[PDB]
Design a protein around this ligand. Structure first.
Ligand SMILES: Nc1ncnc2c1ncn2[C@@H]1O[C@H](COP(=O)(O)OP(=O)(O)OP(=O)(O)O)[C@@H](O)[C@H]1O
Ligand SMILES: [Zn+2]
Length: 253
């Protein structure tokens, strides 16, 4: 953590393999205006002023989210310390004018992204023609900012900066928006290999470095408000045509 000058944040990293959140602190400097926006969020260029521990910001005043038993007591090891080290340029995302964004939802979005990141590794283990990867994402509590009209602290999510032409390959409701095979085959892979317990769609990013994915599950629970359940899964099916990569992976037509 550097001096000076920016704003402090509590930084949360989820680690799927121990199934725990890792709580840290960082300092960051964010541009006043967004460089981009989509249906739900605005994105801002940001630079890291370093990552440190959470010692100064005691947890549990009580009523915790995430609850204490979901939090690692040790945080010495994490991705943030290298990927957001001092001087790193990265992206910060805020929900637009939010009504429906509870605290739990931000953590849901980050966890969802980490799950998708596991699916990417699993896809890559089949050695397809093009490997894929999902970016890290983290929750940040912007503790230096005045709480909202309702007294909630300001939350956001952050992720690495993608350099290149950002493209959306499918949506979370049936749209197939480019001719590329790998993104559609990856979505189908997740459906079949999960035994239809889930699907990853809204495959989008620069080349095969993806971010902002969306998972549908049949019960429609969790995975944020973009989880459209069976309906989302079925929409994907109606517009999906298998391609050579699906064939290479031996997926059912
Ligand atoms: N990591 C990144 N690096 C560079 N640009 C990004 C990155 N993530 C998002 N963007 C840009 O910011 C825009 C909005 O971000 P994002 O897609 O995460 O939110 P959203 O648009 O609300 O989600 P959706 O469009 O799927 O509803 C994107 O459409 C893209 O132009
Ligand atoms: Zn297919």
């Amino acid at each position: 953590i550097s001096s000076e000058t920016g704003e402090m944040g509590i930084l949360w990293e989820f680690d799927p393999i121990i199934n725990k959140w890792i709580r840290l602190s960082m300092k960051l400097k964010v541009e006043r205006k967004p460089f981009a926006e989509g249906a739900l969020r605005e994105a801002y260029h940001t630079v890291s002023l370093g990552v440190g521990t959470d010692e100064n910001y005691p947890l549990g005043t009580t009523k915790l989210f995430p609850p204490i038993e979901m939090i690692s007591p040790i945080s010495k090891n994490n991705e943030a310390m290298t990927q957001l080290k001092n001087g790193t340029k990265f992206v910060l995302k805020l929900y637009k004018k939010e009504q429906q964004a509870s605290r739990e939802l931000y953590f849901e979005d980050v966890k969802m992204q980490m799950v998708c990141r596991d699916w990417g590794n699993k896809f890559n283990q089949k050695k397809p023609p093009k490997k894929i990867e999902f970016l890290m994402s983290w929750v940040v509590e912007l503790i230096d900012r005045s709480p909202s009209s309702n007294g909630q602290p300001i939350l956001c999510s952050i992720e690495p900066l993608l350099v290149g032409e950002f493209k959306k390959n499918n949506s979370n409701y049936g749209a197939v928006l480019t001719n590329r095979s790998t993104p559609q085959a990856f979505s189908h892979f997740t459906y079949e290999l999960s035994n239809k317990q889930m699907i990853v769609v809204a495959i989008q990013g620069v080349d095969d470095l993806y971010t902002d994915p969306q998972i549908h599950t049949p019960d429609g629970k969790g995975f944020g408000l973009g989880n459209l359940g069976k309906a989302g899964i079925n929409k994907f099916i109606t517009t999906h045509k298998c391609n050579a990569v699906c064939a290479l992976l031996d997926l059912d037509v």
